[PDB]
Write an enzyme that holds these catalytic residues in place. Sequence first.
Site, PDB file in Angstrom:
ATOM      1  N   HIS A 197      13.392 -11.989   8.017  1.00  0.00           N
ATOM      2  CA  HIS A 197      13.273 -12.964   6.927  1.00  0.00           C
ATOM      3  C   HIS A 197      13.156 -12.272   5.574  1.00  0.00           C
ATOM      4  CE1 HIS A 197       8.726 -12.703   6.965  1.00  0.00           C
ATOM      5  NE2 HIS A 197       8.946 -12.892   5.670  1.00  0.00           N
ATOM      6  N   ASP A 256      12.251 -12.743  14.481  1.00  0.00           N
ATOM      7  CA  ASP A 256      12.101 -12.243  13.128  1.00  0.00           C
ATOM      8  C   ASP A 256      11.871 -10.723  13.194  1.00  0.00           C
ATOM      9  OD1 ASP A 256      11.916 -12.303  10.332  1.00  0.00           O
ATOM     10  OD2 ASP A 256       9.898 -13.131  10.319  1.00  0.00           O
ATOM     11  N   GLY A 287       3.809 -11.044   1.109  1.00  0.00           N
ATOM     12  CA  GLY A 287       4.091  -9.651   0.766  1.00  0.00           C
ATOM     13  C   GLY A 287       3.693  -8.662   1.862  1.00  0.00           C
ATOM     14  N   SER A 331       4.643  -9.319   4.962  1.00  0.00           N
ATOM     15  CA  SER A 331       5.698  -9.506   5.971  1.00  0.00           C
ATOM     16  C   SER A 331       6.439  -8.211   6.286  1.00  0.00           C
ATOM     17  CB  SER A 331       6.651 -10.576   5.471  1.00  0.00           C
ATOM     18  OG  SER A 331       6.067 -11.864   5.661  1.00  0.00           O
TER      19      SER A 331
END
Lengths: 247, 12
Positions: free
Chosen positions: A46, A97, A196, A198
């Site tokens: 993502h 993801d 942030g 991720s």
Amino acid sequence: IIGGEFTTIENQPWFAAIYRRHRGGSVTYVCGGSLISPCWVISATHCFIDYPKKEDYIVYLGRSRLNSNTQGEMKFEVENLILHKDYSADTLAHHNDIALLKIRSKEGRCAQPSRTIQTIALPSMYNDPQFGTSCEITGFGKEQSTDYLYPEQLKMTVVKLISHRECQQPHYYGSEVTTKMLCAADPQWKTDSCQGDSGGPLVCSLQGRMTLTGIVSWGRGCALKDKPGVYTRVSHFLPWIRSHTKE
Amino acid sequence: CSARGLENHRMC
């Protein structure tokens, strides 16, 4: 990271800082990642899906600060940006993801191990810690949900793994969570990953070995009661990782 | 857009 503690890269030396260059020359932080071999960083799809071109990105290893250089750091281009073909986005609950970044310096070289740059081991297939186990998360994400700025210094915290049984309850996340995802949170909900963080590592110690158990993926808000962080379950993607790291 | 899942997204 909401709560937790400031740290330096010596304490998470596989941590990769990923930035994007904008047309005009502006560079901004994108996401975390983890070095899994000298030429490969693992992260979340993502983070890249809206801007999939490899030439937009810069990866740093051995970096403790967001907008200042750390002595000994290494700077890389992205030779290949590999996103998971079965990625999907449903409200916020991203499926599959996971992403791979093959890194290469201007010199044409990969990562060189040092005090500040090391790899993290991958788990064995379908081998995860028992629920209730404490694990660490690391990133440059927001320190408060209401913040505008990211912290300039790397942070880490500890969260506890939550069973799929508990995470799938309606008052947690219901059907948004799959068996290819792991939930983790603090018992007081007082510490968590945030915007942030991720793509960054969730690391647990399994049989005396530090192991990349998860990758920061999604959550509703941050540090909210009954809303854990949700992480890509790395032990369910080993065949995907193994095939694509030969590209 | 203020939380995990939408970093580096064209809407946000």
